[PDB]
Scaffold this active site. Structure first.
Site, PDB file in Angstrom:
ATOM      1  N   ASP A 340       0.809  -1.208   0.000  1.00 50.52           N
ATOM      2  CA  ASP A 340       0.000   0.000   0.000  1.00 50.52           C
ATOM      3  C   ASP A 340       0.856   1.278   0.000  1.00 50.52           C
ATOM      4  O   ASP A 340       0.457   2.279  -0.599  1.00 50.52           O
ATOM      5  CB  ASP A 340      -0.946   0.024   1.200  1.00 50.52           C
ATOM      6  CG  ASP A 340      -2.086   1.004   1.009  1.00 50.52           C
ATOM      7  OD1 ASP A 340      -2.784   0.912  -0.033  1.00 50.52           O
ATOM      8  OD2 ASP A 340      -2.274   1.873   1.884  1.00 50.52           O
ATOM      9  N   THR A 466     -13.055   7.885 -12.600  1.00 52.98           N
ATOM     10  CA  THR A 466     -12.009   7.356 -11.727  1.00 52.98           C
ATOM     11  C   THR A 466     -12.396   6.064 -10.968  1.00 52.98           C
ATOM     12  O   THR A 466     -11.595   5.531 -10.225  1.00 52.98           O
ATOM     13  CB  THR A 466     -11.534   8.479 -10.741  1.00 52.98           C
ATOM     14  OG1 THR A 466     -10.216   8.183 -10.218  1.00 52.98           O
ATOM     15  CG2 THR A 466     -12.538   8.664  -9.601  1.00 52.98           C
TER      16      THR A 466
HETATM   17  C1  LIG Z   1      -9.348   7.786   0.416  1.00 51.26           C
HETATM   18  O1  LIG Z   1      -8.826   7.585  -0.915  1.00 51.26           O
HETATM   19  C2  LIG Z   1      -9.716   7.773  -1.979  1.00 51.26           C
HETATM   20  O2  LIG Z   1     -10.290   9.095  -1.892  1.00 51.26           O
HETATM   21  C3  LIG Z   1      -9.305  10.145  -2.035  1.00 51.26           C
HETATM   22  C4  LIG Z   1     -10.008  11.459  -1.756  1.00 51.26           C
HETATM   23  O3  LIG Z   1     -10.351  11.551  -0.389  1.00 51.26           O
HETATM   24  C5  LIG Z   1      -8.693  10.095  -3.434  1.00 51.26           C
HETATM   25  O4  LIG Z   1      -7.737  11.146  -3.577  1.00 51.26           O
HETATM   26  C6  LIG Z   1      -8.040   8.718  -3.680  1.00 51.26           C
HETATM   27  O5  LIG Z   1      -7.689   8.605  -5.057  1.00 51.26           O
HETATM   28  C7  LIG Z   1      -8.998   7.559  -3.332  1.00 51.26           C
HETATM   29  O6  LIG Z   1      -9.961   7.404  -4.405  1.00 51.26           O
HETATM   30  C8  LIG Z   1      -9.950   6.206  -5.134  1.00 51.26           C
HETATM   31  O7  LIG Z   1     -10.323   5.145  -4.218  1.00 51.26           O
HETATM   32  C9  LIG Z   1     -10.598   3.880  -4.862  1.00 51.26           C
HETATM   33  C10 LIG Z   1     -11.805   4.019  -5.764  1.00 51.26           C
HETATM   34  O8  LIG Z   1     -12.917   4.508  -5.019  1.00 51.26           O
HETATM   35  C11 LIG Z   1     -11.459   4.996  -6.880  1.00 51.26           C
HETATM   36  O9  LIG Z   1     -10.467   4.417  -7.714  1.00 51.26           O
HETATM   37  C12 LIG Z   1     -10.963   6.343  -6.308  1.00 51.26           C
HETATM   38  O10 LIG Z   1     -10.358   7.089  -7.359  1.00 51.26           O
HETATM   39 CA   LIG Z   2      -9.245   5.938  -9.394  1.00 55.79          CA
END
Ligand SMILES: CO[C@H]1O[C@H](CO)[C@@H](O)[C@H](O)[C@@H]1O[C@H]1OC[C@@H](O)[C@H](O)[C@@H]1O
Ligand SMILES: [Ca+2]
Ligand SMILES: *[C@@H]1O[C@H](CO)[C@@H](O[C@H]2O[C@H](CO)[C@@H](O[C@@H]3O[C@H](CO[C@H]4O[C@H](CO)[C@@H](O)[C@H](O)[C@@H]4O)[C@@H](O)[C@H](O[C@H]4O[C@H](CO)[C@@H](O)[C@H](O)[C@@H]4O)[C@@H]3O)[C@H](O)[C@H]2NC(C)=O)[C@H](O)[C@H]1NC(C)=O
Ligand SMILES: *[C@@H]1O[C@H](CO)[C@@H](O[C@@H]2O[C@H](CO)[C@@H](O)[C@H](O)[C@H]2NC(C)=O)[C@H](O)[C@H]1NC(C)=O
Ligand SMILES: *[C@@H]1O[C@H](CO)[C@@H](O[C@@H]2O[C@H](CO)[C@@H](O)[C@H](O)[C@H]2NC(C)=O)[C@H](O)[C@H]1NC(C)=O
Length: 475
Positions: A340, A466
């Protein structure tokens, strides 16, 4: 070969769906070790909604119909927990819109439930109307954590970079489909402050900006730069908005190019023990932090997408170097799944990881793996952009290691230590992105070509959000 591998990914997706349906549906997720349920996403059935785009692409009509019936009964106006604008937008809003675009387009003959399909847009509209008050602030920059009943928030004075800049794709797609420009206006107004950053001290290198934005006036509150969690997807969406509509978002593309060039010039970093490896570092007031996260590995995929769309070979080359660094973190552990978080500061190498740092090029900070998709995602873009078979094979090797290490009788579980036999200990957790992202990218790397696959040059007719939910491109 590839048909059999594709069928094997469909089998592992079916395995987890059966367990989720058996022990948790309609709650948000399956707890894979105790065979029970949890609700980390407001209780609207996140694992079911995140699984829709993947099931459509895999052609599983039974799973699609079950989810379409569920969506119709959801009441997005009620929940007993606080609501994340970011998480709710990228999983639920994008998941319903993606399903609609896929069933209204390339997969129009998979099911007969036009009224239920039509309801995917109806419920997307409903969801945004319940969330939109979050944007009703002085600057237009939203409060990410809100109470949808009272309309109150957590009292924050600033909103994060990624949570502020990873909404425009979903909210704009909603306006284009409905005709109500309100959604695009709100999200684009918030994005505006990120494209023209102020004060200038908040933009240390061209296109690379700070990590927090003041909600009252739109000015950045710090000058910390990175592609890590909290920042990442803002940069991801700059180039993706250009692919959505190059006419309307040429400006977003220009800002991404500056970010890409500055990243290659200042954040690129090679471990002292292994100079042939490349990772990205973070930067704060002239100091470089030599560590990264599994989250950051979406980076190679972004450089590859921007590189092929803009016919920039130097961006394609750099994206492949990042892809190699991330593959190294995976193939250097006992399970063949990467950590991680990790580091490479020559001055901070742990005494017990000396031999390891010396041969692998990094030392591990956190050995857990929470069923994350970012490395497989970037390997997927490398295969589609270069056409080389080795990247497909790296997707397959990672998929097999996850299926051997994380699988339980009901689904798949996060593990505590990727460098110990069997992953150490399994956590009683299966996030909804197991269905939306891990299973989709692993299948697409081995499945038939179709409009939903990522393409080269200006040929994309779909663009992925995303959470791996593909959105039809504008007009
Ligand atoms: C806590 O990590 C997630 O949220 C963050 C914002 O608070 C993002 O910066 C980070 O990329 C992450 O988001 C990914 O988490 C896994 C899936 O939900 C998606 O691939 C998101 O992009
Ligand atoms: Ca992502
Ligand atoms: C465990 O992970 C390892 C780390 O990721 C992985 O190692 C290799 O991974 C890549 C395998 O393809 C490999 O990258 C290729 O390297 C080729 C050789 O480059 C070397 O020599 C040249 C000399 O000119 C130097 O410039 C390089 O720095 C390097 O020393 C290179 O030819 C190749 O590039 C061609 O192909 C790409 C598309 O793939 C084109 O875009 C490009 O134009 C070229 O035609 C590519 O860069 C990488 O070097 C290597 N990593 C390391 C550090 O060893 C292992 O394979 C993996 N092990 C297992 C079991 O899977
Ligand atoms: C969101 O705000 C609502 C207020 O509208 C909170 O619900 C109230 O909570 C108080 C305190 O226990 C109760 O006495 C009221 O009866 C509740 N009102 C209603 C109509 O439910 C709710 O607790 C908040 N939610 C979160 C996640 O904090
Ligand atoms: C993913 O894991 C499943 C479960 O371990 C594998 O399926 C089993 O494979 C063995 C052969 O080694 C069979 O004897 C069992 O009957 C299978 N069980 C089930 C439920 O099908 C599967 O082969 C793994 N997938 C890949 C690609 O390795």
């Amino acid at each position: 070969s590839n048909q059999a591998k594709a069928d094997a990914v469909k089998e592992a997706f079916q395995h987890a769906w059966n367990g989720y349906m058996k022990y948790a549906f309609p709650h948000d997720e399956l707890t894979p070790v105790s065979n029970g349920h949890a609700d980390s996403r407001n209780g609207w059935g996140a694992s079911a909604v995140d699984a829709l785009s993947t099931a459509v692409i895999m052609g599983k009509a039974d799973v699609v119909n079950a989810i379409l019936e569920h969506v119709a009964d959801i009441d997005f106006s009620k929940t007993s927990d606080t609501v994340s604008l970011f998480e709710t937008t990228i999983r639920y809003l994008a998941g319903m819109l993606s399903g609609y675009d896929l069933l209204q387009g390339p997969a129009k003959n998979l099911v007969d439930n036009q009224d239920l399909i039509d309801g995917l847009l109806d419920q997307s509209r409903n969801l945004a109307d319940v969330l939109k008050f979050a944007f009703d602030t002085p600057s237009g920059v939203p409060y990410n954590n809100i109470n949808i009943t009272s309309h109150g928030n957590d009292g924050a004075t600033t909103n994060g970079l990624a949570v502020t800049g990873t909404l425009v794709l979903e909210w704009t797609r909603l306006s284009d489909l409905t005709g109500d420009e309100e959604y695009a206006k709100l999200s684009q107004k918030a994005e505006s402050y990120l494209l023209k950053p102020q004060p200038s001290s908040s933009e240390p290198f061209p296109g690379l900006v700070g990590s927090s934005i003041n909600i009252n006036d739109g000015q950045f509150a710090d000058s910390r730069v990175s592609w890590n969690g909290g920042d990442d997807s803002f940069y991801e969406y700059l180039i993706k908005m250009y692919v959505y509509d190059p006419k309307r978002f040429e400006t977003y593309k220009d800002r991404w190019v500056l970010a890409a060039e500055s990243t290659i010039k200042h954040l690129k970093s090679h471990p002292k023990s292994r100079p042939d490896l490349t990772f990205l570092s973070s930067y704060s007031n002239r100091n470089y932090d030599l560590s990264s996260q599994h989250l950051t590995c979406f980076d190679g995929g972004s450089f590859l997408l921007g590189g092929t769309v803009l016919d920039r070979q130097d961006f394609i080359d750099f994206g492949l170097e990042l892809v190699d660094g991330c593959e190294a973190t995976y193939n250097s552990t006992l399970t063949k799944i990467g950590p991680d978080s990790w580091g490479w500061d020559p001055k901070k190498v742990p005494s017990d990881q000396k031999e390891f740092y010396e041969k692998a090029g990094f030392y591990i900070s956190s050995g857990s793996y929470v069923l994350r998709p970012e490395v497989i995602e970037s390997f997927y873009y490398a295969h589609r952009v270069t056409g080389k078979e080795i990247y497909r094979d790296w997707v397959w090797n990672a998929f097999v290691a996850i299926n051997s290490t994380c699988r339980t009788d009901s689904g798949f579980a996060a593990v505590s230590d990727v460098n110990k036999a069997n992953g150490g200990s399994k956590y009683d957790n299966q996030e909804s992105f197991l269905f939306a992202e891990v299973m989709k990218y692993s299948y697409l790397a081995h499945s038939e070509d179709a409009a939903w696959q990522v393409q080269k040059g200006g040929k994309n007719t779909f663009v992925y959000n995303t959470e791996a939910h593909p959105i039809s491109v504008a007009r």
